[PDB]
Coordinates of C-alpha atoms and ligand atoms in Angstrom, one line a residue:
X1 CA 15.9 36.7 4.7
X2 CA 17.6 37.9 1.5
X3 CA 21.4 37.4 2.7
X4 CA 20.1 33.8 2.2
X5 CA 18.6 34.4 -1.3
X6 CA 20.7 33.2 -4.3
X7 CA 20.0 32.8 -8.1
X8 CA 19.4 29.1 -9.1
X9 CA 22.1 29.9 -11.7
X10 CA 24.7 30.1 -9.0
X11 CA 24.4 26.3 -8.6
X12 CA 25.0 23.5 -11.1
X13 CA 23.3 20.0 -10.4
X14 CA 26.1 17.4 -10.6
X15 CA 24.5 14.0 -9.5
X16 CA 20.9 13.1 -8.4
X17 CA 21.2 11.5 -4.9
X18 CA 15.9 8.9 -3.2
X19 CA 14.4 12.4 -3.4
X20 CA 14.6 15.7 -5.2
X21 CA 17.9 15.8 -3.6
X22 CA 21.0 16.6 -5.6
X23 CA 24.6 16.9 -5.3
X24 CA 25.4 20.2 -6.7
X25 CA 28.2 22.7 -7.1
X26 CA 28.2 26.2 -5.8
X27 CA 30.1 27.5 -8.8
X28 CA 31.7 30.7 -7.3
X29 CA 33.3 28.7 -4.5
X30 CA 33.8 25.3 -6.4
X31 CA 31.9 23.9 -3.5
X32 CA 30.0 20.6 -3.4
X33 CA 26.7 21.3 -1.7
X34 CA 23.4 19.3 -1.5
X35 CA 20.3 20.8 -2.9
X36 CA 16.7 20.0 -2.1
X37 CA 14.3 20.9 -4.8
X38 CA 10.5 21.1 -5.0
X39 CA 8.9 19.3 -7.9
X40 CA 5.1 18.6 -0.3
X41 CA 3.3 21.8 -0.5
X42 CA 5.0 25.0 -1.3
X43 CA 4.2 26.9 1.9
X44 CA 5.5 24.0 3.8
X45 CA 8.7 23.9 1.7
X46 CA 9.2 27.6 2.3
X47 CA 8.6 27.5 5.9
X48 CA 11.2 24.5 6.3
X49 CA 13.7 26.9 4.6
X50 CA 12.9 29.7 7.0
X51 CA 13.4 27.4 10.0
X52 CA 16.8 26.3 8.8
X53 CA 18.0 29.9 8.6
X54 CA 17.7 30.1 12.3
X55 CA 19.7 27.0 12.9
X56 CA 23.5 27.2 13.7
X57 CA 25.2 24.2 15.3
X58 CA 28.1 22.2 14.3
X59 CA 26.2 18.9 14.4
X60 CA 23.1 20.2 12.4
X61 CA 23.2 20.3 8.7
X62 CA 24.1 23.9 7.7
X63 CA 21.9 26.1 5.5
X64 CA 23.9 27.8 2.7
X65 CA 21.4 29.5 0.8
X66 CA 17.8 29.2 -0.7
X67 CA 16.2 30.1 -4.0
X68 CA 12.6 31.1 -3.1
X69 CA 11.6 33.9 -5.5
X70 CA 10.5 31.8 -8.5
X71 CA 10.0 28.0 -9.0
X72 CA 11.7 25.7 -9.0
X73 CA 12.6 26.5 -5.3
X74 CA 15.9 25.4 -4.0
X75 CA 17.2 24.9 -0.4
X76 CA 21.3 24.5 -0.5
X77 CA 23.0 23.0 2.4
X78 CA 26.4 21.7 3.1
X79 CA 27.2 18.3 1.7
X80 CA 28.2 15.4 4.0
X81 CA 30.6 13.3 2.0
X82 CA 29.7 9.9 3.5
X83 CA 25.8 10.1 3.2
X84 CA 23.6 8.7 5.9
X85 CA 24.6 7.3 9.2
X86 CA 22.7 4.0 8.8
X87 CA 24.4 2.7 5.6
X88 CA 27.8 4.1 7.0
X89 CA 27.6 2.0 10.0
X90 CA 26.4 -1.1 8.1
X91 CA 29.3 -0.7 5.7
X92 CA 32.1 0.5 7.8
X93 CA 35.3 -1.1 9.0
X94 CA 34.5 -1.7 12.6
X95 CA 38.1 -1.8 13.8
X96 CA 38.1 2.0 12.7
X97 CA 34.6 2.8 13.7
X98 CA 35.1 1.1 17.2
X99 CA 33.3 1.7 20.5
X100 CA 35.0 5.1 21.2
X101 CA 33.8 6.3 17.7
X102 CA 30.3 5.1 18.5
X103 CA 30.4 7.2 21.7
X104 CA 31.8 10.2 19.8
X105 CA 28.8 9.9 17.3
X106 CA 26.3 9.7 20.1
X107 CA 27.8 12.7 21.8
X108 CA 27.5 14.6 18.6
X109 CA 24.0 13.8 18.0
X110 CA 22.9 14.5 21.6
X111 CA 24.8 17.8 21.4
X112 CA 22.6 18.8 18.3
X113 CA 19.5 17.6 20.1
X114 CA 20.4 19.6 23.2
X115 CA 20.6 22.6 21.0
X116 CA 17.2 22.0 19.5
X117 CA 15.7 21.4 23.0
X118 CA 17.1 24.7 24.1
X119 CA 15.8 26.5 21.0
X120 CA 12.2 25.2 21.2
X121 CA 12.4 22.9 18.1
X122 CA 11.5 19.2 17.8
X123 CA 12.8 16.9 15.1
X124 CA 10.1 14.1 15.0
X125 CA 12.2 11.8 12.7
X126 CA 15.3 11.1 14.5
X127 CA 16.8 7.9 13.2
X128 CA 20.2 6.9 11.9
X129 CA 18.8 7.2 8.3
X130 CA 18.4 10.9 8.8
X131 CA 21.9 11.5 10.2
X132 CA 24.7 12.4 7.8
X133 CA 28.4 11.6 8.1
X134 CA 31.5 13.7 7.1
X135 CA 35.1 13.0 7.2
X136 CA 36.6 11.8 10.6
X137 CA 33.3 10.6 12.1
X138 CA 31.7 14.0 12.1
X139 CA 28.0 13.4 12.4
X140 CA 25.1 15.9 11.6
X141 CA 21.5 15.7 12.2
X142 CA 19.5 16.5 9.1
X143 CA 17.3 19.4 10.0
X144 CA 14.7 19.8 7.1
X145 CA 11.8 18.5 8.9
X146 CA 12.1 20.7 12.1
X147 CA 9.0 22.1 13.8
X148 CA 8.7 25.0 16.2
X149 CA 7.4 23.9 19.6
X150 CA 7.9 25.5 22.9
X151 CA 9.9 22.7 24.8
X152 CA 7.2 22.4 27.3
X153 CA 4.5 21.7 24.8
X154 CA 2.9 19.0 22.6
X155 CA 2.4 18.7 18.8
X156 CA -0.6 16.9 17.7
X157 CA 0.2 15.2 14.3
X158 CA -2.4 15.6 11.5
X159 CA -5.2 13.0 11.5
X160 CA -4.3 9.8 9.7
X161 CA -0.5 10.6 9.8
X162 CA 1.8 7.5 9.2
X163 CA 4.7 7.0 11.5
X164 CA 8.1 5.0 11.4
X165 CA 6.5 2.8 14.0
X166 CA 9.6 1.3 15.5
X167 CA 11.3 4.8 16.4
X168 CA 8.0 6.2 17.5
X169 CA 7.3 7.1 21.2
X170 CA 4.1 5.4 22.7
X171 CA 2.3 8.6 23.1
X172 CA 2.9 9.4 19.6
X173 CA 1.7 6.0 18.4
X174 CA -1.5 6.1 20.6
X175 CA -2.4 9.7 20.5
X176 CA -0.5 11.4 17.7
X177 CA 1.4 13.5 20.3
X178 CA 4.9 14.5 19.9
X179 CA 7.1 16.6 22.1
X180 CA 11.0 16.9 22.8
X181 CA 10.5 13.8 25.0
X182 CA 9.3 11.9 22.0
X183 CA 12.6 12.9 20.3
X184 CA 14.2 11.6 23.3
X185 CA 12.6 8.2 22.9
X186 CA 13.6 8.2 19.3
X187 CA 17.2 9.0 20.3
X188 CA 17.2 5.9 22.4
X189 CA 16.4 3.8 19.4
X190 CA 19.0 5.8 17.4
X191 CA 21.5 4.7 20.1
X192 CA 20.4 1.1 19.6
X193 CA 20.9 1.5 15.9
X194 CA 24.5 2.9 16.5
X195 CA 25.3 0.2 19.0
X196 CA 24.4 -2.5 16.6
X197 CA 26.0 -0.8 13.6
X198 CA 22.8 -0.3 11.9
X199 CA 20.6 -3.4 12.7
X200 CA 16.8 -2.8 12.1
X201 CA 15.0 -2.3 15.6
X202 CA 12.7 -4.8 17.3
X203 CA 14.0 -7.4 14.8
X204 CA 11.1 -9.8 13.4
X205 CA 8.4 -8.1 15.6
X206 CA 5.2 -7.5 13.6
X207 CA 4.6 -3.7 13.4
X208 CA 0.9 -3.9 14.6
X209 CA 2.1 -5.4 17.9
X210 CA 4.8 -2.9 18.7
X211 CA 2.6 -0.6 20.7
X212 CA 1.0 -3.5 22.8
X213 CA 4.5 -4.8 23.6
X214 CA 5.7 -1.4 24.7
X215 CA 2.7 -0.8 27.1
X216 CA 3.6 -4.1 28.8
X217 CA 7.2 -2.8 29.3
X218 CA 8.9 -4.8 26.4
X219 CA 12.0 -3.1 25.4
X220 CA 14.9 -4.1 23.1
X221 CA 17.5 -6.1 24.9
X222 CA 21.1 -5.0 25.2
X223 CA 23.0 -5.2 22.0
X224 CA 26.0 -7.5 22.0
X225 CA 29.1 -5.5 23.0
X226 CA 27.0 -2.5 24.3
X227 CA 28.4 -1.0 27.5
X228 CA 26.0 -1.1 30.3
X229 CA 26.1 2.5 30.9
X230 CA 24.9 3.2 27.3
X231 CA 22.1 0.6 27.6
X232 CA 21.0 2.2 30.8
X233 CA 20.6 5.4 28.8
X234 CA 18.7 3.7 26.2
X235 CA 16.4 2.3 28.8
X236 CA 15.9 5.8 30.3
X237 CA 15.0 7.1 26.9
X238 CA 12.4 4.4 26.8
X239 CA 10.6 5.3 29.9
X240 CA 6.7 5.0 29.3
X241 CA 6.0 8.2 30.9
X242 CA 7.6 11.1 28.8
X243 CA 8.4 13.2 31.7
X244 CA 10.4 10.4 33.3
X245 CA 12.8 10.4 30.1
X246 CA 15.9 12.4 30.6
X247 CA 16.4 15.9 28.7
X248 CA 18.9 16.1 26.0
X249 CA 21.2 18.2 28.2
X250 CA 21.5 15.4 30.7
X251 CA 21.9 12.9 27.8
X252 CA 24.7 15.0 26.3
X253 CA 26.5 15.6 29.6
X254 CA 26.5 11.8 30.3
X255 CA 27.9 10.9 26.8
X256 CA 30.4 13.9 27.1
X257 CA 31.7 12.3 30.3
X258 CA 31.9 8.8 28.9
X259 CA 33.7 10.0 25.8
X260 CA 36.2 12.0 27.5
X261 CA 36.9 9.2 30.0
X262 CA 37.6 6.8 27.1
Ligands
LIG301 C1 19.5 19.6 0.6 O1 20.1 18.7 1.5 C2 19.3 17.3 1.8 C3 18.0 17.2 1.7 C4 17.4 15.9 1.9 C5 18.0 14.9 2.4 O2 17.5 13.5 2.6 C6 19.5 15.0 2.6 C7 20.0 16.3 2.4 C8 21.5 16.6 2.7 C9 22.1 17.6 3.1 N1 23.5 17.4 3.1 C10 23.8 16.2 2.6 N2 24.9 15.6 2.4 C11 25.0 14.4 1.9 C12 23.9 13.7 1.5 C13 24.0 12.2 0.9 C14 25.0 11.9 0.0 N3 25.1 10.7 -0.6 C15 24.4 9.7 -0.3 C16 23.2 10.0 0.6 C17 22.3 8.8 1.1 O3 22.6 8.3 2.1 N4 21.3 8.5 0.4 C18 21.1 9.1 -1.1 C19 20.4 7.5 0.7 C20 23.1 11.2 1.2 C21 22.6 14.2 1.6 C22 22.6 15.5 2.2

């Protein structure tokens, strides 16, 4: 798609942000942008740009342009001024980022995931570190790793793939299998990260025993201050059987109701 194509000279790099990711300026609009460069495999990078062209949602990071004719290749996106959600929650004023703001953040993220669910994408690395925060608690999900997968289907990760174990669904840990329901599992963990203002999940629990614990129905306990209804949602996301987990449309509806009633 050539409406997306721009010359690399249209952008000036201002600050390196790691991970081959720069804060840049789109000079004709004096616009601050994020720029991902390639110093992963080329074809993988180009397909990631291709997927992002199809994505249009208020809570998914918006593609602005690509430079894909000649190396080095660029993917240019909107810039989210406050950076990743994990550090944002860890460093925030909790009187400002209070319970209703946490609900608002969860509603936004579930809205993005509902859109992906509907458009046959999976994310596969849903976590606070991969959400970005703009002004007035706007949250966007980073969408650079999206894979096409018809919502009824399963992706099998390449042999020897390494996971973020504590965000990873049981079926992914055991069988390298991913679906939108494994994104639902990860969303549950993300909810826990939000509720704890960015605590690390399963604290102190040895990574090699996480799977064994999950199969015996161990789950993280309700965070201090966490509303019971939100915790119930976490627990639904963490059902062992992927088909028992709620869809993102249901999750989003549930949060929309909670947020509106707050
Ligand atoms: C081409 O865009 C990307 C490619 C890779 C990536 O990981 C993210 C982005 C991305 C898009 N919009 C963004 N808006 C803002 C920031 C950003 C600003 N400041 C600090 C941080 C941060 O938390 N750390 C550096 C740890 C992130 C990143 C982005």
